[PDB]
Amino acid sequence: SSFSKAPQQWATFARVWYLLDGKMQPPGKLAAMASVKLQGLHKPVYHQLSDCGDHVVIM
């Protein structure tokens, strides 16, 4: 809980890679969570002016 300012900010705004399987899956229900993770709308630190956003790899 006690970190310095720069590594605390780096941990808060860290970018995360997600994995997603597309076998026997509807593209709309895939793209709903793909859009959410590309926004970073799963982050409580989300802001539209910030560069928050996560990578998604779909196989």
Partner 1 sequence: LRSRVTDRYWRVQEVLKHARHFRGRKNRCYRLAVRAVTRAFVKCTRARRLKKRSLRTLWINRITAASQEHGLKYPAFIINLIKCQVELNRKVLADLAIYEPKTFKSLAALAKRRREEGFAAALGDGKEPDGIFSRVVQHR
Partner 2 sequence: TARGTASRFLTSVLHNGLGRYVQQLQRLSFSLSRDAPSSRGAREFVEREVTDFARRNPGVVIYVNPRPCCVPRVVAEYLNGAVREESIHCKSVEEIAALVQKLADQSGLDVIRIRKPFHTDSPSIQGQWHPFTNKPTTLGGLRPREVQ
Partner 3 sequence: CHVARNLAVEQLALSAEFPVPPPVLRQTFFAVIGALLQSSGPERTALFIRDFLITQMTGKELFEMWTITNPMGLLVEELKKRKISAPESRLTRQSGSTTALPVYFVGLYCDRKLIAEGPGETVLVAEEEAARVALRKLFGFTENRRPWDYSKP
6 membership: H or E segment, kind and range: helix 5-12
Q: Between 19 and 24, name the residue whose CB sits nearer to partner 1.
A: 19
Report the phi/psi class of residue 40: left, alpha or beta, with left for phi > 0 and alpha for psi in -120 to 50: left
How many residues are there in the chain?
59
Pairing outcome for strands 17-20 and 55-58: parallel
41 binds, among partner 2, partner 1, partner 3, none (CB under 5 to 8 A by kind): partner 1
| Interface with partner 3, residue 51, by CB under 8 A | no
Query: Could you tell me the smallest distance in angstroms from the CB atom of residue 50 to partner 2?
Result: 14
Which positions lie near partner 3, rule CB under 8 A? 1-4, 7-8, 10-11, 14-17
